[PDB]
Design a protein around this ligand. Structure first.
Ligand SMILES: O=C(O)[C@]1(O)C[C@H](O)[C@@H](O)[C@H]([C@H](O)[C@H](O)CO)O1
Length: 308
């Protein structure tokens, strides 16, 4: 095609993310009259999310997914998006990104500093905790060998609840759980399904600890080369895909418990009051490290009413 573009992701072919990217790719191809074809590179084929972001910066990958929180690697105050229990719901995540001074500035910096254009934002689920033993309360977390992604905020969740974190790449998690090299992981229900973690985890606990969004990103190197009518095709497609993406996750969150129970998983509902209280010193560390910019991001987010 005139533009043979590539979209990389960590998720596999059964996932919501892949389904939404498929929808995006199909719309772009049809609405561009065949001038743009987007090929998909799932399962971290091109590297992890960090690697794929760098490929957008340098222009060698055209599209990828990222979370708003992941930009904490560049702007430490952006950790606010994944401080456990701070962001209440997706309503708050949307307004945090698009409707605060902090979020608008973050979008500008992504463009200027990191060479990527934000096309759209989706909901990507609320993270829960699976394990090889029941989590009936915060006590059961003590010493749990809990896989986390390579991200400070997930490491902190594990630390502050009393668990023993093992960072590792998403692609490695299934085997780590199967071999009992680790005792559990934490991810939204959709990923528990897509990656088949339920096959190798007998327990799921509704910790509700971190709210994930997902950003449709394009490389500025690619976006600048598209004539403006094709830019609009891409943008419009990303906005339509993100709405679909959000719907997949919302519907799954109401449907997946009966799926997991049918697959033999036991679901627990630990009291979250001590989970939340355990984070208080982490918040104070965040404010100590990030100073007035973090204080300010936190105040802007905490000001957002969670009710639509
Ligand atoms: O490895 C995981 O469990 C994963 O959920 C995979 C997902 O594709 C990715 O977007 C996130 C992200 O890297 C973290 O949430 C930190 O921002 O991590």
């Amino acid at each position: 095609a005139d533009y043979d573009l590539k979209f990389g992701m960590n998720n596999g072919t059964s996932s919501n993310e892949y389904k939404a990217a498929e929808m995006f790719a199909k719309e772009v191809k049809e609405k561009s009259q065949g001038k743009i074809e987007i090929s998909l590179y799932p399962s971290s084929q091109l590297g992890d999310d960090r690697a794929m972001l760098k490929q957008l910066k340098d222009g060698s990958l055209d599209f990828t997914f990222a979370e708003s929180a992941r930009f904490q690697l560049f702007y430490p105050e952006a950790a606010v998006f994944a401080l456990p229990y701070v962001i209440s719901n997706y309503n708050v995540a949307q307004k945090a990104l698009f409707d605060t001074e902090f979020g608008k500035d973050l979008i500008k910096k992504m463009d200027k500093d990191l060479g990527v254009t934000l096309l759209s934002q989706a909901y990507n689920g609320t993270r829960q905790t699976t394990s090889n033993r029941a989590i009936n309360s915060i006590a059961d977390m003590k010493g749990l060998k809990l896989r986390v992604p390579n991200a400070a905020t997930n490491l902190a969740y594990a630390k502050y609840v009393g668990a023993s974190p093992t960072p590792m790449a998403f692609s490695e998690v299934y085997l780590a759980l199967q071999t009992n090299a680790v005792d559990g992981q934490e991810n939204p229900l959709a990923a528990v399904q897509a990656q088949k973690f339920y096959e190798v985890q007998k327990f799921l606990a509704m910790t509700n600890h971190i709210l994930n969004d997902q950003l449709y990103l394009v490389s500025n190197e690619t976006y600048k080369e598209l004539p403006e009518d094709l830019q609009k095709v891409v943008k419009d497609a990303a906005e339509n895909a993100a709405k679909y993406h959000t719907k997949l996750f919302v519907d799954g969150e109401k449907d997946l418990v009966t799926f997991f129970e049918k697959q033999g998983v036991k679901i627990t509902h630990p009291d979250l009051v001590p989970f939340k209280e355990s984070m208080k010193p982490y918040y104070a560390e965040f404010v100590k490290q990030t100073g007035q910019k973090g204080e300010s991001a936190l105040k802007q987010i905490e000001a957002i009413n969670p009710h639509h």
